[PDB]
Amino acid sequence: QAEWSYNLGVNGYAYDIATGGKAPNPTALATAANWDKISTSIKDTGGVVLVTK
């Protein structure tokens, strides 16, 4: 049996643990409404997603 844990943080974004859960599953990590925009400017937040079929 093996067990481990690690913290996950995105720049300019606060995880909504209230919706994500105390121990969020990888489906909650990708679930919407589980991330809160913080840095007033999007330029302050780090990273941008480009959806390309």
Binding site: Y13, A30, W35
Partner: peptide, 15 residues
């Protein structure tokens, strides 16, 4: 996965 959702939630996304 966390980064992808975070950016989308923050609006940092282009389709």
């Amino acid at each position: 996965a966390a980064g992808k959702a975070a950016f989308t939630a923050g609006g940092a996304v282009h389709d």
